């Protein structure tokens, strides 16, 4: 089952996360391979505070969107790219932008954006409670291995995340999101 | 690739050598060290080869928790080396021994053909006597111990670099050459709580920490914000992309202590003329790794010189 740590919240744990995102807060989410950090990808202030709180990053953020239709609004998506997005492998796919429509600080001065689709039940549930794309960056200060255990995340990400979505299933082997692309007629994994 | 020290370690293999201490401990209470001094230029801001030859061996002879007392001085001199430069070197040696409260009791002088040595080399050996409950060794660090440095890092290294390679800086940099046996004497008030003492010479602070790690079988974590360094050294290194952790020091000691005695060790240093810039800089880890933390908690391994 899920747990919500941070400030008090009456609702079910997904609804709480939706509320926190809506308010421009950083949420640390326990997924399949570890923790990730999320904000509203249309909220410049929230993206700015995450940039400040990591402070040693600079790297562009990946963004999670609800479906292919939503991606086609922000990015150019060829059929092979759509196959990579929809794949059960569920990676981040690096895609060419279609005009600046996201918040500043996501992927500035770059013509590409890393987009992923939902991959765990928690994301599908989160998507029906929000109507904006979300940053989904690794759950780490700087660039070390992402956190995997609840107590490890609560300590390491204390100065980054405002709230946490935890669960009581151990991740045994931490594993990051894949990052791939399509170019020159073949998949090119990063 | 000076794997000469490997040939050395194979042939003179014994308990004393395997230990890789700053000084051998003989009969249980007396200590013995030796060092050669080949610095160019012979006269540099803040010192010369003479002051260096004494201080370095006085220091090495104390690093075991000891009062240094007696020194030997060996001189290897080029035919036609200016005698007025020699009088200056010898004078500097006399002055340093006097300040250290030490005496040069034996020696040697050899003169070699012109071109068989660049001007002058000096070797010094030292004898010291251990304080009552001294137990200082590079093997003595345990996890939980605190690491201190007696003052700013990288002075000597950058000073001779600047003079030798004619590098002009916005601020002139002086060498830190000093005898530290007085400072060590005040530290040895703490007895067994003082675990490790080493001067970060060839290879700087980085190399010492690795030597502590290897021999104690531990790791060490240091803190960027806590590292003392003169602004002149900071920007000199920042201009050339150098890590001051790799530059040599000649008036500094790295100290490892018991957790509860760290505050006392800092104040003992801060109340001594060569210890005003002392800082607690790190902690002895469980990890067999040498790591440095930046502001906010970004860990990375310290690279070896
Ligand atoms: Mg030494």
Check: CB of residue A54 under 8 Å from CB of residue A168. Answer: no
> Ligand 1 centroid vs B224 CA: distance in angstroms?
24
Check: CB of residue B275 under 8 Å from CB of residue B257. Answer: no
- Resolution number, Å: 2.6
β B219-223/B290-293 pair status: parallel
For the four alpha carbons of B274, B280, B283 and B289, in that order, the dihedral sign comes to: negative
Say yes or no: A70 and A53 in one domain.
no
CA distance B175 to B47: 6
Considering only CB atoms, which chain A residues are within 8 Å of B298? 56, 141-142
Question: Which of B291, B295, B298 has the most A C-beta neighbours within 10 Å, making it the best mutation to test the interface with A?
Answer: B298
Task: Judge whether B1-135 and B136-305 match in fold.
Answer: no
Say yes or no: A3 and A60 in one domain.
yes
**Residue that has been written with the tokens 């001007």 in this structure:** B119
CA distance B305 to B301: 13
Say yes or no: A52 and A90 in one domain.
no
Residue A163, beta-bridge partner list: A27
Q: How close is the nearest chain A Cα to the Cα of B297, in Å? A: 8
What is the length of chain B? 305
Range of the domain at A2: 1-64+118-174
> Ligand 1 centroid vs B198 CA: distance in angstroms?
6
* Residue (of A43, A56, A27) closest to A137 by Cα position: A27
Yes or no, beta carbons of B299 and A144 under 8 Å apart = yes
Say yes or no: A131 and A166 in one domain.
yes
CA distance B47 to A142: 43
User: In sequence order, what DSSP letters do the residues of A106-172 get, joined into one string?
Assistant: SSTT-SEEEEE---SHHHHHHHTT--S-EEEEESSSTTSPPP-SHHHHHHHTTTT-SEEEEESS--S
Say yes or no: A83 and A73 in one domain.
yes
Backbone break loci in chain B, preceding residues, C–N > 2.5 A: none
A56 touches chain B (CB under 8 A): yes
Q: Count Cα neighbours of A190 within 13 Å in the Cβ-side half-sphere.
A: 12
Please state the residue numbers annotated as binding site of A for Mg(2+).
138, 176
What CATH code is carried by the domain that includes residue A3? 3.90.870.40
Per DSSP, B74 falls in state: E
CA distance B152 to B226: 11
Say yes or no: A8 and A41 in one domain.
yes
β A112-116/B66-78 pair status: unpaired
Q: Count Cα neighbours of B106 within 13 Å in the Cβ-side half-sphere.
A: 5
CB atoms within 10 A of CB B204: 23
**What does R_g of chain A's alpha carbons equal in angstroms?**
16
- A8 burial via Cβ count (<10 Å: 0-12, 13-18, 19+): exposed
First to last CA, chain B: 12
Q: Count Cα neighbours of B258 within 13 Å in the Cβ-side half-sphere.
A: 12
Domain count, chain A: 2
CA distance A60 to A40: 15
Say yes or no: A112 and A35 in one domain.
no
A159 touches chain B (CB under 8 A): yes
Strands (E), A9-111: 27-30, 35-40, 63-64, 92-96
> Ligand 1 centroid vs B199 CA: distance in angstroms?
5
Domain ranges for chain B, please list them: 1-135, 136-305
3-state secondary structure string, B87-136?
HHHHHHHHHHHHHHCCEEEEEEEEEECCCCCCCEEEEEEEEEEECCCCCC
Say yes or no: A112 and A180 in one domain.
yes
Say yes or no: A101 and A179 in one domain.
yes
Say yes or no: A7 and A84 in one domain.
no
> Ligand 1 centroid vs B35 CA: distance in angstroms?
9
Tokens in use for B120? 């002058």
Yes or no, beta carbons of A141 and B294 under 8 Å apart = no
Considering only CB atoms, which chain B residues are within 8 Å of A158? none
Check: CB of residue B45 under 8 Å from CB of residue B159. Answer: yes
Tokens in use for A45? 């202030």
Phi, psi for B63 (deg, rounded to 5): -60, -5
What CATH code is carried by the domain that includes residue A85? 3.30.110.120
B176 marked ligand binding residue? no
Q: Method of determination?
A: X-ray
- Under CATH, domain B136-305 is a member of which superfamily? PurM-like C-terminal domain (3.90.650.10)
Distances (CA, A) of B53 to B14, B91, B104: 27, 12, 12
Name the strands in the sheet holding B103-112, side by side, starting at the edge strand that comes first in the sequence.
Answer: B24-26, B30-37, B120-130, B66-78, B103-112
Per DSSP, B153 falls in state: S
Tokens in use for B136? 């200082």
Phi, psi for B279 (deg, rounded to 5): -145, 145
* Residue (of B51, B116, B114) closest to B82 by Cα position: B114
CA distance B205 to B218: 16
Residue B300, beta-bridge partner list: B292
Say yes or no: A104 and A10 in one domain.
no
Say yes or no: A1 and A60 in one domain.
yes
Class of domain B1-135: alpha beta
- Burial of A88-110, coded b for 16+ CB within 10 Å and e otherwise, reads eebbbbbbeeeeeebbebbbeee
């Amino acid at each position: 089952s899920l747990s919500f740590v941070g400030e008090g919240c009456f609702d079910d744990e997904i609804k709480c996360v939706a509320k926190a995102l809506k308010e421009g807060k950083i949420v640390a989410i326990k997924g399949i391979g570890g923790f990730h950090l999320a904000v509203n990808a249309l909220d410049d202030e929230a993206v700015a505070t995450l940039r400040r709180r990591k402070k040693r990053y600079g790297k562009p953020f990946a963004v999670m969107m609800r479906d292919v239709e939503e991606v086609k609004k922000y990015c150019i998506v060829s059929p092979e790219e759509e196959r990579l997005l929809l794949s059960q492998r569920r990676p981040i796919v690096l895609l060419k932008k279609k005009g600046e429509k996201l918040a500043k600080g996501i992927a500035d001065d770059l013509d590409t954006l890393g987009v992923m689709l939902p991959y765990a039940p928690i994301h599908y549930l989160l998507m029906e409670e929000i109507d904006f794309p979300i940053v989904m960056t690794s759950g780490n200060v700087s660039e070390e291995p992402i956190c995997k255990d609840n107590e490890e995340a609560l300590e390491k990400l204390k100065d980054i995340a405002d709230v946490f979505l935890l669960n009581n299933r151990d991740i045994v082997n931490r594993i990051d999101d894949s990052v791939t692309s399509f170019n020159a007629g073949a998949e090119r994994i990063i | 690739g000076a794997l000469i020290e490997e040939v050395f370690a194979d042939a003179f293999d014994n308990e004393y050598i395997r230990a890789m201490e700053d000084a051998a401990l003989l009969f249980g209470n007396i200590t013995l060290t030796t060092d050669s001094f080949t610095v160019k230029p012979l006269f540099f801001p803040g010192g010369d080869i003479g002051k260096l030859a004494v201080c370095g061996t006085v220091n090495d002879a104390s690093m075991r928790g000891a009062k240094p007392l007696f020194l030997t001085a060996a001189f290897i001199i080029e035919e036609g080396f200016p005698v007025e430069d020699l009088k200056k070197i010898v004078k500097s040696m006399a002055e340093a021994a006097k300040e250290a409260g030490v005496k040069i009791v034996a020696g040697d002088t050899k003169v070699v053909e012109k071109g068989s040595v660049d001007r002058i080399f000096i070797n010094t050996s030292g004898i010291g006597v251990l304080y009552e409950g001294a137990n200082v060794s590079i093997k003595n660090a345990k996890p939980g111990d605190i690491v201190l440095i007696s003052g700013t890092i990288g002075d000597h290294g950058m000073a001779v670099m600047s003079a030798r390679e004619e590098l002009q800086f916005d601020t002139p940099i002086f060498s830190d050459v000093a005898p530290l046996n007085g400072l060590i004497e005040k530290l040895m008030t703490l007895g067994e709580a003082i675990k490790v003492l080493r001067d970060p010479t060839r290879g700087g602070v980085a190399e010492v920490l690795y030597e502590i790690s290897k021999m104690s079988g531990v790791g060490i974590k240091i803190y960027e914000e806590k590292l003392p360094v003169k602004e002149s050294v900071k920007s000199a290194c920042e201009f050339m992309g150098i890590d001051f952790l790799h530059l040599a020091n000649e008036g500094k000691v790295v100290v490892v202590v018991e957790r509860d005695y760290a505050e006392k060790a800092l104040e003992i240093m801060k109340s001594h003329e060569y210890g005003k810039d002392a800082e607690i800089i790190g902690e002895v880890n469980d990890s067999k790794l040498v790591t440095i933390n930046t502001i906010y908690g970004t860990s990375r391994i310290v690279d070896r010189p």
